[PDB]
Amino acid sequence: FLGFLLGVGSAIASGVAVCKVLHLEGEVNKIKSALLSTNKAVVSLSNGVSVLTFKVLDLKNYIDKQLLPILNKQSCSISNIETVIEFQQKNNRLLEITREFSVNAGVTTPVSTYMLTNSELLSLINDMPITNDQKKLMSNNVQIVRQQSYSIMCIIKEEVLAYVVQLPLYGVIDTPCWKLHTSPLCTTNTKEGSNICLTRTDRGWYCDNAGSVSFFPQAETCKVQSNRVFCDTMNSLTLPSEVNLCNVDIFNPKYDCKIMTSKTDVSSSVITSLGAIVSCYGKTKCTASNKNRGIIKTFSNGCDYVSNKGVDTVSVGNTLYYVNKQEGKSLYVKGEPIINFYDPLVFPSDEFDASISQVNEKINQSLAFIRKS
Amino acid sequence: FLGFLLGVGSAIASGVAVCKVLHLEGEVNKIKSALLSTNKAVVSLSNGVSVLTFKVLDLKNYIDKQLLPILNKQSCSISNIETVIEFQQKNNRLLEITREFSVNAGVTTPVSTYMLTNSELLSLINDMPITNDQKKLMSNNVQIVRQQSYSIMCIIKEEVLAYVVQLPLYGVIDTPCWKLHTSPLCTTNTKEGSNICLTRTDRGWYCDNAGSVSFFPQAETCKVQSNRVFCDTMNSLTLPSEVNLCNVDIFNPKYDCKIMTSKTDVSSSVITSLGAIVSCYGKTKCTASNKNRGIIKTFSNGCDYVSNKGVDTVSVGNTLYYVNKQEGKSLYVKGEPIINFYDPLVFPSDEFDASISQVNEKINQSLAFIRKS
Amino acid sequence: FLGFLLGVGSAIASGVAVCKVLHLEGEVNKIKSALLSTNKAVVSLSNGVSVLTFKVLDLKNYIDKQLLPILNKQSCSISNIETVIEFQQKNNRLLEITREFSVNAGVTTPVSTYMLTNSELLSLINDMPITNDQKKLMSNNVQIVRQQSYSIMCIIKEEVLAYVVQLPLYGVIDTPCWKLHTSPLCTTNTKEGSNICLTRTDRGWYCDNAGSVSFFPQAETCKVQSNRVFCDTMNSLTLPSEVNLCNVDIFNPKYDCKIMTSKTDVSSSVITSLGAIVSCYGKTKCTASNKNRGIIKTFSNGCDYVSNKGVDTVSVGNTLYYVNKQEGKSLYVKGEPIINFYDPLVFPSDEFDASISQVNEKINQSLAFIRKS
Amino acid sequence: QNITEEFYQSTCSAVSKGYLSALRTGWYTSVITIELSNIKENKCNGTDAKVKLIKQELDKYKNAVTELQLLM
Amino acid sequence: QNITEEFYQSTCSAVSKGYLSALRTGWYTSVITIELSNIKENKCNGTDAKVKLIKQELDKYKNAVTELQLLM
Amino acid sequence: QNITEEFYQSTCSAVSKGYLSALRTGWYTSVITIELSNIKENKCNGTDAKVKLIKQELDKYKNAVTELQLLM
Ligand SMILES: *[C@@H]1O[C@H](CO)[C@@H](O)[C@H](O)[C@H]1NC(C)=O
């Protein structure tokens, strides 16, 4: 819910910069001369930055030394038809690259096999100026690399087509991460109104980074392979470590945990990594079921939780939820719901982006106003 | 605007569960022995659920009994070229599946023809644990089925490639649905400020479901056929039927209609199923026009509505809107705008997610606060 | 931040209307007779509107006068395999169009090369009822045209398959535009709390249009060429021109600039067209660096700005930002931060969508409340 | 020139002037047709391999047309 | 008849009745298999061009199998 | 050890620990080229079927090159 606090930045600024440096008079001939010998070479660009350069497809060689010599020599009628298919190969790639650039306005999100093959991508990763740990990580997760990289069509001139493949740089690796799931926490009185609801808004991913915590509010922009969380530092805030205290105690004086207040008595289900949170309010049907034995639990009104062990389905009203069957150990920290600490008549019925201290200050203000009489 | 109230859930949890059970030592030989006879078979998985299994492509048979026998027998030169094309067929599917899984990180959001053909998809639908009406509905809208289903690449070992195609289940069918469109309702006083705006926030789809109403706030995540509304119960709240009273009268005591208050005097247009609502405030030009007659109506300040009969275009300021020219009957329920019922000095100048009763209670509180002096 | 103020509208209403007009008795025979002579013709539809019509692929001619004569002559024995490939050509386009429509449920959001080739699209643009400037603009940026246009599958009958390609019009051209970037502006006192933050919410694009200003809050839904800004008037609000005064003076009485108040002391970076704004608060490390010389600036606490000349990278905490290397002139307007004009005890700690007059007036409210005791 | 940018430290905000407009403002529809053939079901001996390939291509074509008819 | 619509000027809101439901109530998983071949490094004389084409296709197949194995 | 999860009924929220980080701290650009040919686009007899097919393929290639040129 904290996506508006993030700063905005240009994602393809580096690739576009390399392109603008690639338009200089004599830079395409530089790259072509460098790749005249082999299919890959390090080239110092006119801006000073040294980039790796790949020749992934050679059509001038094939066209000018294998197809046109046999075609327009004498008796232009050709004797073998395997040349037609051999030319349909090695040319589909150019057509598909052209079409991908046409439909994606010249810069394509995840980098396809047509843009860059797995052998070429691994060869590019292995020859990068990074530590061996990042090389191993990138080589094992080539799919996440493709998802997190761009390909900007750069220039086409001097018989050469150029595009910049802008790959991620996984500088921070192997630090502990944790996901935070939240759900509305309301009172369970039978009255139609006067039912106050409180929720935590700091949901999303958190990772240790240089003594601080990189927090990602839009958890949708974070991929998970096995237990590794690939995130983008640009879609993130940077917070002190004390924010983690919000889990051991939400009233601690060090960090102020952002919350949200409302009066909407809505039953919901939030599926976590290993289990499910169920906020069952009103006359709604809340059910936990196993695939082979049917319904095994009926939820009482309030905020409850079940583990993914033995539970395969969570039903809330008409919504059906399949729980993640990932293995692990779950823990239930018993405690009294915080919502039982406030007065329903003095509680701020609506505040989108607030915190514990802010709500407490408004409560202090209203109580000081009331006490004067 | 109520997209934040719904709960979050894992979409491919079922497919991921079926994958995790296929990684057990064995379980692949089970499927292989079951498919040893035919190309389709029901297999009891080690987790107990019995799943249907298809062998959509036989490459071991073709490679090892039709191509390699003729190649590595003697005289490796082949005499016919139709074998080359016959091998380009029946192999494009595997390559395309591999590439789709590589670019999409192993899970594709629309199920392509390469993953599952229409004949195979219809055969899978017809052998599903659903009623014949649901079978007919899925068979007539195979494209919407492909749009609402996933395909998770599962495992590749023991000379077998496996992926789980996770299809939607249309349990609720033929129940009446209705969409609710809303627009800001402001006052039309001549002052530049002090202009209060009120809006209904319950916009979206509503469908009868098990005596309750499944409500979908993000109507953009719902596809529409001729008059059939395909939605996902996971992107939905479950409400009592009395919410419908919010249409016949918004002040009824049974249900409390969620609203929103603001002070932003912005002219807007909301195009409905058959017609257009125009909230024309400020000094903005609001126009209703026919294709062949030009401007045919000028809107006065306030919230007005026009039918799609005779009106083909709605202009607000510089924005042009084409109205849906679909057949139907429109009705204009005359009534006084609700915004004229509140005092501008007691009106909450900013409240995103509120209701009628909440606004009335805050008015009572503020009036008691003012009266104390 | 003002993306919620926009109205909703049907995007493909015009194409769907032309489709509903194509189902009338005789309209497809009309189009076929018009295209009987050439491959392009202007047709006056029964709806009054005159549309351009293209015959992009002729298979009936080829199949019925080049394939069926040779196939079913004596015993369908074929003598040459080049016929197979010649039929794989001229047929791939129909299959790809079918696949594109099947996966997208009949309406595709970017118009691909399969739907309409670049030659056909340019031929269609050049014969449109638009001025020569609009023709030149559309012809130079065909990729942006494809990105902002639809293709609605319309009808298939009378041996003809028809789909309507719904192209943009670009009515407003060459008028001056400007982008507005915003960043949080907080105080820099050393206390952990009591630190007020102010931000501008009117970020996004602005263009002059018919004496008014078309404002686009979702600047991500605007493509940018060299210096041309392609936006959609539907993703826009319409404001008076006086809004531009919010740049020359933010306390002017004519227009009221919408702002946002908070108390979140979070360091952020906002990259603009030609430089970067850095809001460095707390104990966060904020750095400006050149590619070849390393760190060249350390930011003090507050809101500062750097130009893209000599600065290639901005680091905030653990987040790295690459600056756009686009050519231009930057200017630094020195002035006192507005946040130093308010009392921290009277400042509204939370208001998402507010304005200068609203926040300033609420300050009067709270000050009158405090002074009464 | 061609592009300028001003940073107001007063309100911590930047303005980027010098761009030109291309606003949609409307639509233009255009009917695009593809002439099809309703080839009648053949009946001949599928003994050749190239004839089998042509039969497969005809099946692909007819199935595409059938999906398109069935897509309404 | 089919579709109707009512506009309430009271609350400035429209309701569109007459539609029918097709709601995703659940999921159905299905395992789909492809039987593969373990080419054990073939070796034959590359004198023909068609044999070169078949070898290129075999290379494509083996590279596909290896790529599928590498996403684990 | 492995992934663990704790559910706090106090604040109605769950935390899932045990994951590892791989953060995009930066970018690495790399120029990738495809060498094209300026083939002389004419002069052969379109009498043969194989030659006509090769000429159509050359048309496809040059139209691709032209489309790429139009991406500026
Ligand atoms: C705030 O201060 C005084 C009220 O006595 C007045 O001069 C000023 O106009 C007020 N501004 C408001 C109410 O916006």
Three-class SS of C181-218? EECCEECCCCCCCCCCEEEECCCEEEEEECCEEEEECC
| Cβ-based neighbours of C276, under 8 Å, separated by 6 or more | C269, C270, C288, C305, C306, C308, C311, C314, C321, C323
Asked if B touches F (at least 3 Cβ pairs < 8 angstroms), the answer reads no
- What is the CB neighbour count within 10 angstroms for residue C356? 17
Using alpha carbons, list the distances in angstroms from residue C304 to B79, C279, C297.
76, 7, 11
E4–chain B Cβ distance below 8 A for any pair: yes
Measured CA to CA, the distance from residue B189 to residue B345 in angstroms comes to: 14
Structure token pair of residue D31? 């009917």
Helix axes B92-103, E49-70, angle to 10 degrees: 30
A315: left (phi over 0), alpha (psi -120 to 50) or beta: beta
Structure token pair of residue C332? 């630094």
Give every strand in the sheet of E26-35, ordered side by side.
B40-44, B50-58, E26-35, B160-169, B150-157, B107-108
3-state SS track over B82-136: HHHHHHHCCCHHHHHHHHHHHHCCCEECCCCCCCCCHHHHHHHHHCCCCCHHHHH
Question: Whose alpha carbon is nearest atom 13 of ligand 1?
Answer: C361
- Asked if F15 and A180 come within 8 Å (Cβ–Cβ), the reply is yes
Radius of gyration of chain C (CA): 29
Using alpha carbons, list the distances in angstroms from residue C65 to A23, C39, C68, C79.
50, 18, 7, 18
Residue for token digits 């197979």?
C84
Structure token pair of residue C281? 């608060």
Measured CA to CA, the distance from residue F16 to residue F6 in angstroms comes to: 7
Structure token pair of residue B337? 């705008």
Q: Which of B250, B325, B313 is nearest to B278 (CA)?
A: B313
Using alpha carbons, list the distances in angstroms from residue A318 to A297, B212, B236.
16, 8, 9
Give the residue from chain B lying closest to A283, CA to CA. Answer: B240
Structure token pair of residue A165? 């493949």
**Experiment used for this model:** X-ray
- If you count them, how many residues does chain E have? 72
Measured CA to CA, the distance from residue A92 to residue B88 in angstroms comes to: 14
Segment (H or E) for A356 = helix A356-371
Residue for token digits 């060689």?
A61
Measured CA to CA, the distance from residue E29 to residue A312 in angstroms comes to: 14
Q: How many CA atoms within 13 Å lie on the side-chain side of F37?
A: 18
Structure token pair of residue B53? 């299994």
Strands A212-216 and A329-333: unpaired
Strands C160-168 and D27-35: antiparallel
Q: Could you give the 3-state DSSP secondary structure of residue D47?
A: coil
Instruction: Spell out which residues of chain A touch residue F69, defining contact as CB-CB under 8 Å.
Output: 156
Q: Which of C219, C209, C199 is nearest to C243 (CA)?
A: C209
Measured CA to CA, the distance from residue B190 to residue A278 in angstroms comes to: 50
F46–chain A Cβ distance below 8 A for any pair: no
Measured CA to CA, the distance from residue C144 to residue C168 in angstroms comes to: 10
Q: How many CA atoms within 13 Å lie on the side-chain side of C316?
A: 31
Helix axes B132-140, B118-126, angle to 10 degrees: 170
| Cβ-based neighbours of B252, under 8 Å, separated by 6 or more | B245, B246
∠B208-B212-B216 over CA atoms, to 5°? 65
Q: Which of A154, F60, D26 is nearest to C119 (CA)?
A: F60
Strands F30-35 and A50-58: parallel
Measured CA to CA, the distance from residue A301 to residue A280 in angstroms comes to: 5
Rounded (10°) CA dihedral B344, B347, B350, B352: -130
CA of C365 to the centre of ligand 1 (A): 9
Instruction: Spell out which residues of chain D touch residue C103, defining contact as CB-CB under 8 Å.
Output: none
Q: Which of C171, C53, C56, C166 is nearest to C111 (CA)?
A: C166
Measured CA to CA, the distance from residue C172 to residue C189 in angstroms comes to: 48
- What is the CB neighbour count within 10 angstroms for residue A17? 24
Give the residue from chain C lying closest to F56, CA to CA. Answer: C89
Radius of gyration of chain D (CA): 29
User: Which residues lie across from B157 on neighbouring strands?
Assistant: B160
Cβ contacts from C onto F, under 8 A: 24
A354–chain C Cβ distance below 8 A for any pair: yes
Closest Cβ–Cβ partner in E27, E56, E71 for A143: E71
Query: What are the domain boundaries of chain A?
Result: 1-264+336-373, 265-335
Measured CA to CA, the distance from residue C138 to residue C131 in angstroms comes to: 11
Q: Could you give the 3-state DSSP secondary structure of residue C170?
A: coil
Tell me if C42 sits within 8 A of D22, measured CB to CB. Answer: no
| Cβ-based neighbours of D45, under 8 Å, separated by 6 or more | C75, C76, D51
Q: How many CA atoms within 13 Å lie on the side-chain side of B56?
A: 26
Task: Number of helices (H) and strands (E) in chain E: give both, helices first.
Answer: 1, 3
CA of C261 to the centre of ligand 1 (A): 20
Q: Which of B257, B168, B202, B185 is nearest to B3 (CA)?
A: B202
Give the residue from chain D lying closest to B141, CA to CA. Answer: D71
Instruction: Spell out which residues of chain B touch residue C99, defining contact as CB-CB under 8 Å.
Output: 113
Best probe residue, ligand 1, of C341, C362, C364, C366 (max atoms within 8 Å of C-beta) = C364
Question: Whose alpha carbon is nearest atom 2 of ligand 1?
Answer: C364
Give the helix ranges, DSSP H, for chain B: 13-22, 28-34, 59-62, 68-71, 82-88, 92-103, 118-126, 132-140, 142-147, 245-248, 356-371
Structure token pair of residue A345? 């008549």
CB < 8 Å & 24+ apart, contacts of D55-61: D56/B89, D57/C84, D57/C87, D57/C88, D57/C91, D60/C91, D60/C95, D61/C91, D61/C94, D61/C95
Give the residue from chain C lying closest to A46, CA to CA. Answer: C292
- Classify the C-alpha dihedral F2-F7-F8-F11 as positive or negative: positive
Q: What is the DSSP string of C80-111?
A: -SHHHHHHHTTTHHHHHHHHHHHHTTTEESS-
Measured CA to CA, the distance from residue A286 to residue C93 in angstroms comes to: 51
Measured CA to CA, the distance from residue C220 to residue C54 in angstroms comes to: 33
Backbone angles phi, psi at B297, to 5 degrees: -155, 140
Residue type for position C231: C
SS3 content of chain E, % helix, strand, coil (to 5): 30, 40, 30
Structure token pair of residue C347? 């400042």
Measured CA to CA, the distance from residue F11 to residue E29 in angstroms comes to: 35
